[model samples]
Target: TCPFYKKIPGTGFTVDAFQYGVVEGCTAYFLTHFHSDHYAGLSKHFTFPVYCSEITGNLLKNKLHVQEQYIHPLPLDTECIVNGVKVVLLDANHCPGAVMILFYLPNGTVILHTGDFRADPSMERSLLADQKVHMLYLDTTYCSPEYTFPSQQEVIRFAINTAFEAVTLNPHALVVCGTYSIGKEKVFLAIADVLGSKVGMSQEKYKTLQCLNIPEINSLITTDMCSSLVHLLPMMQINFKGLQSHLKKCGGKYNQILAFRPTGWTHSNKFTRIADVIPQTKGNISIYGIPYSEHSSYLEMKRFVQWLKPQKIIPTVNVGTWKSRSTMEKYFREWKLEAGY
Candidate 1:
């Protein structure tokens, strides 16, 4: 989702780097997801056409209020010719509606742009059978070996158990959590449902969830703050000071605040397995720094590149500095060598 390239090579379609408006002479636009980083350049008034997953298209219309004429919602796993180039969308496993764009050019060149994915054995099996890919634009969020954590499922279960225990112990706790505009649904939704409590969300956030069409989540969410003990706030406001402000502002209703701040950088990483860690506690008025993320883990990334074995690899993140670009490039080559390519 980084603004690395104005457009994919050998194609007129601009990718997640849409904030620059239109690429010079670009024939079309591609949006990976509704996250601000990827869809930042989009506006209510647009002169160019955009292509993305069907749900993403819905978000652009309902949330962003973009005009419908310029939006083309491409269904997942279907082939279509856009600007004379064949394209297909695959679920990226990052968030609902997020996709990996695959393009087949008239010249027989194949390209895959991974728009923030969580690599899994399931994906390896489903998307494994494919025509040989020539170029791969990878999401390099955890490109370095120093960072790696549990999968989404493992972390979600940990979150559900932790939040439930805290609420059961402290019945008067004002349960809180953090979420992005998209993704991290399982973390907050799991916590809210197991507590059997309603979820408080802003109208905008709730509207965004509506586009996802998850009835279970939509059922939990209410715009009224007083009705929900389990409130999901923006990711930034889950800290001690912020929670303290909230406690004072809300007055004497709850005994303590139990907040879950799920992010990629939250883990201790002392051990690979999450069960080994004695966690789920931050004391009263505490924030649980949960390592719940959408990006694939370090080892997962390595596994993906090895299995794909594309002719050319492109680093999508950390493309700001020349040195970092070279650093990731070296890592890409290093991973490819393991595949003997």
Candidate 2:
């Protein structure tokens, strides 16, 4: 409806139905990644041998909990011919399972889709010089000048420093940090390695981490594991005070207490306000405040696009058309606009 072949209700296109249209002339369909916006409607509707990285297929299977026989796993940087279309996978570096997809058509048109990616100089430079990309589909999640995100290494360091600060304030204080169970499991691992103890995690977080093949950190404290060193505990909300009071009442008698929350708690709206409610008693109360973002920054996005230097650049993410049009207008010297699928 926006600028492609498909016509929809919005964007001034009058269409009969709500379904997405398949490109009529293309020989094969290519999937760039397995994010919800990228793969949501195609899983069941288009069942032809779906080609993607083995990591993506595995993660998709884990998330859906289904045995989808149609998905064909391809290793990173590997090339293969499926339905006569030449396909290659490139490391996306956004997540463990993410990959950028490149397709070479029989007609000599090359299409490269950059799934959500952050610009780590190493990764961005590698992808730019490694191949010939004629047409590009980009993820422009953070394209505006004001949008910015800290590097992954910085985020990790800050989390560890926060934990250290907590221990310095009160040696007996129990600390717990929350991160996404899927991609942010590494944060939990980092926390455990830094803290030198298995911190408590939620049931869903435990399961999600398990699916990602991470070692078991802490099982939801079941009746069987009650006496175990790592025990499952209920999550704390902004108003939670009883648990803090109970932990403080124990004083130095208890060596550790449990805390649990999902990832991205640091960026949450309620993150700062909740701190004031918890009473500071025998042990200090501490929370993790490292910023973690999946999308790349504006400068990074521009750098990646410029480095690729493709013939045509397509923005796939759904921001407003006026904004997108204005961006393309400004960057007209760098890239051309063509039909985007």
Candidate 3:
């Protein structure tokens, strides 16, 4: 029941269904990025050619083991005809290889699917201006006003400063950064470059960074956890109870363990303010929840929608119709009122 899968009317092309274990009769498939959530059921045995960014295709083939024959690289900002539909890829700014899809249907309608992205002002100058968007499938992850967050650069600086402060308090403290399997490379790279220290990552994550082939990232990865002061651990392993167990397993090699989880969900609770640096201690580990996210905030989303002027809006994730509808209603209402529309 994942709603991301959709077929263009009169055209046999399907999109994003492979993640939902769907790969039956369809003209083709389109993958926006390499996020596991976006590639849920996709595997080496995938049957159809998946259209995606060149980097995304590379990751699919090398990391996921998908065959090269089934991977089709779509160059960004370039239009290509597939099943008589004009398709163009736009930089998503969410993660490496992430793209927003713009499909000009045969019926003359323009459909835009913003896979996952942070709103960038340059987007209008690069790809969106003078385009008529008939339908928009939006990434409404932070659709509420309560989710207002600072810029990514600001958040990254905050994280680096906080980590240094924690380490200054206890030089022997082991700094563990919580990151997704693919995204948040900037944070890890920044920390490594600023501290002039290498980062320890699991073999799987190391391979992913290797595939990305980023010079800043390449210089920071190490397989030996003890060799680096900072350990780039998977996000799921950095939770409260999980951190306690992970630190305990690390033994007494370090006097303290400082864990940083860079995610927007840290502000999910009512008491936590946006961009507020709050640290909680559990046993020998201290956890810092940073409001670092790649998704557009409510203000950013509003500006995006207003600029696009889509006839209809579709929420990509399932947040319940009532909640999504109410959120969008308030958003557009305030938008129109402010714009004097």
Candidate 4:
């Protein structure tokens, strides 16, 4: 009964709702990516077949260890049939393997389920232009008017510039990056790229990185400790106490830490310049919260909704709260009214 865990009205398929076991009317399970919020309920014992991106499939097998035979890896942009409905996977522009699930129904309705997506020009140009979408299963994570952040590309540049300051000014500082299991690899990868420094990663993350299949990234990863000044750590490990424990193991080779924690939550609506969120140095570390969000901003989401002009919108986030969900519904209604439907 919680949001997407319920059946998608037009079909027997449910997208990214494994947490509730199986919905009563749903048959096929579609996982858009590997983020825990989306893939919450899935386990090794999940007996149903799951359709997801090829990269997400690897993470499920290698990380979550879900039953392999039930893991179906779908090729992006390919026309395929599932339970007699045509479907395609288009780049969601959210994470490495993230995708927007597009479906063509028996009643000739075209629906799109944006699992957790960031709106991009590439999606507008190639993925969306051709479809006459009747309904949108949207990622409403930041659909509110207040959740504003800069473009993903601009944020990366700002992150590089922020890191450049430390790399340029401090000889005693070593850069440590915050990353999720599969997201935000670009920020650290580019930091290493521009500074031309080797990247040290944990053995588990190192194995996960190989699944990304980028040649440049593969060459930059290293196991040697002192060989690289830049290191990648999971988001939870980037805190002061954690950093101190880490630097302690560094054996005083580095006296201070220059750390970056990149996510949408760090971004605030009051700040537009994107430089205001940079934290002042406290203790032995300067934690810069890069507003590197993978979800669509309010304005960006507005644009996408107008473009598709879906007759109905099925929100995938903020469903637990009436206020948040209602606000999004207001906009959906207003946009539909504006579109002459």
The backbone clash count of each candidate, in order, is 1, 4, 0, 1
| Tens-digit per-residue lDDT, 1-341, candidate 1 | 33544467777778876766446767888998889988886878876888998899999999878899999999887888898889989989888899998889888988888888987767775544667898888898888887788777788888788778877887888888877668888877777788887788888888888888676765878888887888878888877777778777666778788788777864477554676545354455776677777898889989888988889887888888898888888988888777899
Q: Per-residue lDDT of 1-341 in model 2, one digit per residue for the tens?
A: 22352221112221111124543343333454545655555534444445566666766566654357866778776677766566677887676667776667776777777767776677655535766777776777666655655566766666566555665665665654444324544455565556665645545655544544333434322233222223334434311364466455444545544343433223332333332223223344333334466677766776666666677766766445786767744654433332121
Query: For model 3, how does the per-residue alpha-carbon lDDT over 42-104 read when each residue is reduced to its tens digit?
Result: 778987778999888889889878998888897889879886788999998888889998888
Q: Give the lDDT of residue 208 in candidate 4.
A: 84
Clashing pairs in 2: 178-263, 179-263, 180-263, 221-232
In order of appearance, the predictions have TM-scores of 0.92, 0.69, 0.89, 0.92
Task: Please give the distance, in angstroms, between residue 85's alpha carbon in candidate 3 and its true position after superposition.
Answer: 2.3
lDDT of 4 by residue, 206-324 (tens): 88877765677658888776878899887899888889888999988898899988867553545557765557577878887777888888888888887777877888778888888
Q: What is the lDDT of residue 74 in candidate 3?
A: 79
Q: What is the lDDT ranking, best to worst?
A: 4, 1, 3, 2
Scanning candidate 3 in windows of ten residues, the lowest lDDT window is: 1-10
RMSD of each: 2.4, 7.6, 2.7, 2.1
- TM-score, cand. 3 vs. native: 0.89
Candidate 3: which pairs clash?
none
TM-score of 2: 0.69
How accurate locally, in lDDT, is each candidate? Answer: 0.80, 0.53, 0.78, 0.81
